Design a protein around this nucleic acid. Sequence first.
RNA 1: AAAAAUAACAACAAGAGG
RNA 2: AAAAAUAACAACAAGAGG
Lengths: 262, 262, 65, 65, 66, 67, 66, 67, 67, 66, 65, 67, 67, 65
Amino acid sequence: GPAMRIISVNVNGIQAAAERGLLSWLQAQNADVICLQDTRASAFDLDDPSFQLDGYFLYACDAELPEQGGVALYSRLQPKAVISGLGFETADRYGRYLQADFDKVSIATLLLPSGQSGDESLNQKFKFMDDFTHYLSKQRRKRREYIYCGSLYVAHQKMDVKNWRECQQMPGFLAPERAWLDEVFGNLGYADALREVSREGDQFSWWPDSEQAEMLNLGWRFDYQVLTPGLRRFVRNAKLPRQPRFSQHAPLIVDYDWQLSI
Amino acid sequence: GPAMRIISVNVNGIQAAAERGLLSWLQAQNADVICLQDTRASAFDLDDPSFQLDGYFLYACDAELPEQGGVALYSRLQPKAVISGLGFETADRYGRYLQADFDKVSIATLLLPSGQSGDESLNQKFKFMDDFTHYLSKQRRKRREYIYCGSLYVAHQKMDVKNWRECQQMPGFLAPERAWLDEVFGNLGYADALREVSREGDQFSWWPDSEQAEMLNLGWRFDYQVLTPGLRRFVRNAKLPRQPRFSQHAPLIVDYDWQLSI
Amino acid sequence: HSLQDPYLNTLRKERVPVSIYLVNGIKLQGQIESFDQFVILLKNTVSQMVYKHAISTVVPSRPVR
Amino acid sequence: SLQDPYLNTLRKERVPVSIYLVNGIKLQGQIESFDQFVILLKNTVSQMVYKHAISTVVPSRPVRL
Amino acid sequence: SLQDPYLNTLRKERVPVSIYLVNGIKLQGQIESFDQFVILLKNTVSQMVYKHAISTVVPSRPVRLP
Amino acid sequence: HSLQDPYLNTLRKERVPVSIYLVNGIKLQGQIESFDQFVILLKNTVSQMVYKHAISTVVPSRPVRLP
Amino acid sequence: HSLQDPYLNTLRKERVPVSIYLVNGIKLQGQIESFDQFVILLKNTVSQMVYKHAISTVVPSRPVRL
Amino acid sequence: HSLQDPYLNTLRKERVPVSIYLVNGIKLQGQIESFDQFVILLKNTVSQMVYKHAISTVVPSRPVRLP
Amino acid sequence: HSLQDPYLNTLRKERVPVSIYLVNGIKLQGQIESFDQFVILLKNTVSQMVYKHAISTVVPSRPVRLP
Amino acid sequence: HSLQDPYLNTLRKERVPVSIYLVNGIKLQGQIESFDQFVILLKNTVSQMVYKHAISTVVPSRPVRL
Amino acid sequence: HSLQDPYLNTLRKERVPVSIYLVNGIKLQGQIESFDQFVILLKNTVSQMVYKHAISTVVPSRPVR
Amino acid sequence: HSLQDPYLNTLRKERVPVSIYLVNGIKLQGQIESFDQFVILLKNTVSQMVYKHAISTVVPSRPVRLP
Amino acid sequence: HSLQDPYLNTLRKERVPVSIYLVNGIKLQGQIESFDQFVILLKNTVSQMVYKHAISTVVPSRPVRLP
Amino acid sequence: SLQDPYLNTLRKERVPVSIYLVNGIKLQGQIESFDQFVILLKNTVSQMVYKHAISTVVPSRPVRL
RNA sequence: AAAAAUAACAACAAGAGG
RNA sequence: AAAAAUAACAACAAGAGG
């Protein structure tokens, strides 16, 4: 039947990931839409032919200061529209959102501040979370399906973290942070594309740069593909490849039964 | 691809509709689940071989007084479960609800009091509407998709009843009644299987017994198949044939792009 | 045994459609075919056995006895 | 023992009680009879609750032995 | 008792059954053996399931015990 | 049943505001009128009757010693 | 009874700080001071009594010999 | 006990890594050191005494069988 | 319209990415290629013409000033 | 009308499949067969007459440049 | 002007049933009996005068011209 | 103007009650008492002034003739 | 402007509180300072300018005559 | 006329006005420019608002002519 | 980034964005 | 009518029904 592959890898800089083999890897995956979060580059830097994958259209939303954000998107088919930004400041001038509008579905890509540097990052993280909650409250009236390929930097449940009793205070597993995912996935009806097929544990996606954590698999699951509820049943195969990763994050490869059209 | 067809018809008595040829019609439609509202017969009356369609399993929920309600269901595949009633007595002792639990979907069939006889039926109708709203508020936490084949006896929109300015005061187009469908389809996110595909006017499911209403097409839409939101996109086509008829109501026929399993 | 056995047998031979609740809140519904000291098997569409240590409550739909 | 005099005292003069199950489901009604294993409570229907799934039994009116 | 003959009829006929535990988790397989206390089933590997933690044992095919 | 009846009897003689936790995490304060092989009574505005197979833990709010 | 009774006793007399897991997932932690057939007396700031039918596992902090 | 004890003995002697699923869904993976008729002891980094009445399933990683 | 076209011409020659709100609430985010007295062509991925009687407002993404 | 008329003549003479979005949001797919100062003749099955004062946008399916 | 006036006259003379879709999506089906600039008279059981600046589309039911 | 003004004059001097429809769907009812090039005066219990650029249709209650 | 501006001047001289319904279907109450062929001023607590192409209807709160 | 001196007095005083569009969308900010067909408003970025989509223009403070 | 279209809400002091 | 399974909420006065 029809199929649609989406990869939502977070790169922590597209230059430092492209030196490690990102673009030679993404070509051999046969994805329809690739969503790149935290690209750490301006719009002129992605205009070079070093990043232009053949067969894919590249669209990017950069930050004003390009080290603080940036979001990229490769697409097999040309979209009906490309919309940058959400409408508020922390999403707009930091370049943490891009949207590719297609025929019936529209595939979005979303970056969040980690909140792991300082308290001002956690404060603008809570600002972004409240404003994006107000955005999701408004977007449920429309007649279009969304795929938010987000790097939320927030883990949902005890299954998504290793040794949750020691991880209660670090940013990424906070109680107002996990209550936000209990609000988005629970009451707002939105689905997780990884939880609809595999409820297996020990499927982590983020690891710190210390080798002792990755050799003992002390991981995190930060990046999601949040689905509008009409998409719940279209999910076939959602996996997180642990070994061929190119950053602190892991790619998220989700195969759907949808047929992507213009 | 995969297909499923669901036919829901309010028969106004299965004996008086079977004398009009209903069972000879339903055999030549290749439906998977046929849902019959206000069947007006006990459980012993549907145990006779006069109503047993070949190839279909018949399950019925009768009232204690068989003239006041009754619900029937024919199924191609045998369900995992058959559940009669939904918890409150105005459908329990009046027999206005049956459910066929299949593999990943449950197809339900629902009858309502019309509120067209007197004011006590209208108060019973408001009681049923509030209790079924409390039921739909509780059923939002489950992972099972529902299709409710509902003889709702309410017309949702100005498109759904012929001349709406003269219809404002009749039971079937009341403002607390249409506000209930505005709350079910709008804020609880449920679909209408007709309006997911066709939004042209002059589709109606019920007419008065007067022939002037028949020939001018002074009809109303009182029949729906109401879908949990994950089913919004599993709707190929939906139709309301005027011509073959067995009741004050036309059949509602819907085709789904979905594959019914045990 | 002085109450459980004349109750399940009365629901069995009269074939009252009963609703059996489990200890995890799952509501099953059907007719009781027979019962041991330890099990009750019910038929809705498919006959299935349910151990009595998982049964919280047996509720008939219509009044019995 | 304690259970056999207390439930007899509770059923002979018919206190409307609330039985809390092990999962948190509460049940209003009055006890009619009880064996070694089950309790038959009845508000509007003859209901049978297994005692291995009962957390607490709370009377609404104060009772003494 | 029908505790033992029903499980013997599911075992000897090799009926693929579904066992629902006391927390809703189902296990599909084929009952290889059983004593008073355990039930061993094999879908992929052999597996011992305790009888105090199951809730329902349903067969895929309609089987009435002799 | 070798050591648990001196513990509950020590709670019964000198009456302690005992907190009993249920198997589903429900906390219940009160005072023990008496206990049985299978069941324990509790004193409050209403007098609770709680079976032992649903009781997870029994703790006193006051540190009591066991002779 | 032939193997849990030496294990609880060698958790008792060496006063190993144990973590005891209830069947609903509640992690209690303290010291084992006494145990009959039916309960285990967990010693902490308050000395509480834990029924054995509500206990999933009893883990030690340090690995001990048996 | 006539059929679970040679099964758990086979799980001991061939030293296969087992996984015990509890009655609340929690997987405890390790290998069985010794079992009573009331408890099982599993070793991964410390020796756990898991009670037999809190266990739903005991499933090994590789397929083995008793003679 | 002596003041309407130092503005659209500045957004055309500097190629500022703009956002055009229509009178029915539809937001079209794009980039002006050319303009008449009556229409404006924008280029997001494909060039489209937009009639000015349907346009409610035109905002730029970054602040700009007139010659 | 320096770009009003040549763009529509280029869409007309090349007879491209075009999509007109009206002022209320209605999407009309067809082909421009003729156009005056006031009207545009879309056509797919039975042709149309579409007034320009209710047209919001006109989107060609293929890339069209003057 | 030069193209809507030969079109509405062709709709008027052969008397084809037209459908006039207004700005707000509301359609009016009937026949065109007469027209000049700024109005179109739609004929039905009663005849109505529709202003031409409140019309989105005018589509006939039969392919003509 | 060659056919609009005799129609409104015929609806005026025969005093036919009209149901006049606005462009947002609002049905007003009254009867036509006066009209210029730009507005129409709809007489009822209050004398309004409806604007012709807000009017979609003008519907008489009874079928009337045109000269 | 043969018949509109006498009606509006009749509304202006007598200082009658009028209600202007816009094309959005919303109402605005108050008197009228002045007008032209494009806008109308309104006296609530705020002094508004209302464009005449967005005005649907103009009604008085009580009937005024027009000579 | 009347629009030009009103908008000139409202521009030179720099009143933080509110413009309500025909669909009900409220815009905040003072007025930089206007010619015949369009108005440039400003609070943070220079917004170009067409006059045929404006319903009302409301000053925040009382304005004299 | 838009319901091939609500035979029509005597009328939402106004959804910084339908 | 039931998440092939939350290496585990020092603990929901208690979802007439998880």
